[PDB]
Amino acid sequence: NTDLKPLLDNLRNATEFWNLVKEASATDNRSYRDALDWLESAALALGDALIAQRK
Amino acid sequence: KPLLDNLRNATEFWNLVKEASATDESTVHNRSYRDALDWLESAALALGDALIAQR
Amino acid sequence: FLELERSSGKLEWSAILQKMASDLGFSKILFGLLPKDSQDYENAFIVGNYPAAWREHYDRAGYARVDPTVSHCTQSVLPIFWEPSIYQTRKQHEFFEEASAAGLVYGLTMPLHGARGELGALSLSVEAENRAEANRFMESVLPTLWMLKDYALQSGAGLAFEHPVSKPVVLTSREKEVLQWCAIGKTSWEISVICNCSEANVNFHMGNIRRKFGVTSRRVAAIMAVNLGLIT
Ligand SMILES: CCCCCCCCCC(=O)CC(=O)N[C@H]1CCOC1=O
């Protein structure tokens, strides 16, 4: 089934953005922090929705 | 599938440590600040990369 | 740059504009937007970091009728630069003198015309020692800010005329402490030595702060709190 939680795609964009920023090897950042902040905030947002399971 | 529960447990651990971070003035540093942060990234990274293989 | 983070809230979306304007080099930024067949400039979606005293004087004096940039936006899609040649009439001359007292001397405005008929303007002001230095800087970042005008118009058109009910936020003494230090530009490690905490401690607190505001970045949440008079 397809639930009413279009958050998995949000995390997909946050992880893919982290996946794009991780490719900049040897560049010598504010973009790394925002990528990590988005990854934590998106995963945490899913988790709060992923605990309202109700058996 | 066996990644969503990891994020569910990491978020609840993050949610439990967030109540402990405002129930007694810190004094709960230990490994718990790092591991709660460390666990959230690992769960999102494993789950997120799996959500990109499904075009 | 390309971290085109477009939120679902007016306050965060406004914070990201201020964050991008300061990153590009501009001191002040204003975003105005009007619905399709509306001509009431006072009752318009206006956000940014302009001086609140100037914005209040601007609306009370009805400066939208005298302001040459809003007149330019109704007839063109090309930018207009804050040059002395744009102020022609006597009322526009007084408008320029008083606007400078508010700090809006050098800058430019990008006319906004949305797909569903929206009319608006995106203004950015720069601080410089002379107009020649200001004109040289705005010409360097003119192509990149030309893209920002269309991205802010497409993302802002959906959140401009809604009325979402924001839920009030309250932070702990520690959370409000580390947030004001992050607002001035201190990175996570630097706040750890000031507040005498671990770096994982401040990173843990910013994560909770970002969930309370509903944002996905700490710098955006930091300027949001000062917009509601929460810090500094
Ligand atoms: C199409 C206009 C929609 C409603 C916009 C209301 C006007 C808001 C003021 C503005 O556009 C910024 C601005 O024009 N700044 C100019 C004028 C004052 O200082 C400047 O240099």
UniProtKB/TrEMBL annotation, chain B:
Protein name: Uncharacterized protein
Domain of life: Viruses
UniProtKB/TrEMBL annotation, chain C:
Xref: PROSITE patterns: HTH_LUXR_1 (PS00622), HTH_LUXR_2 (PS50043)
Listed GO biological process terms: regulation of DNA-templated transcription
Keyword Methyltransferase attributed: no
Pfam families linked: Autoind_bind, GerE
Organism classification: Bacteria, Pseudomonadati, Pseudomonadota, Gammaproteobacteria, Pseudomonadales
Alphabetical list of InterPro entries matching this protein: Sig_transdc_resp-reg_C-effctor, TF_LuxR_autoind-bd_dom, TF_LuxR_autoind-bd_dom_sf, Tscrpt_reg_LuxR_C, WH-like_DNA-bd_sf
Source organism of the structure: Pseudomonas aeruginosa (strain UCBPP-PA14)
Domain of life of the native organism: Bacteria
All residue ranges annotated as the HTH luxR-type domain in the record: 164-229
Name of the molecule in the record: Transcriptional regulator LasR
UniProt keyword Plastid, yes or no: no
Signal peptide: none
Keywords for the protein's UniProt record, in alphabetical order: DNA-binding, Transcription, Transcription regulation
GO terms assigned for molecular function: DNA binding
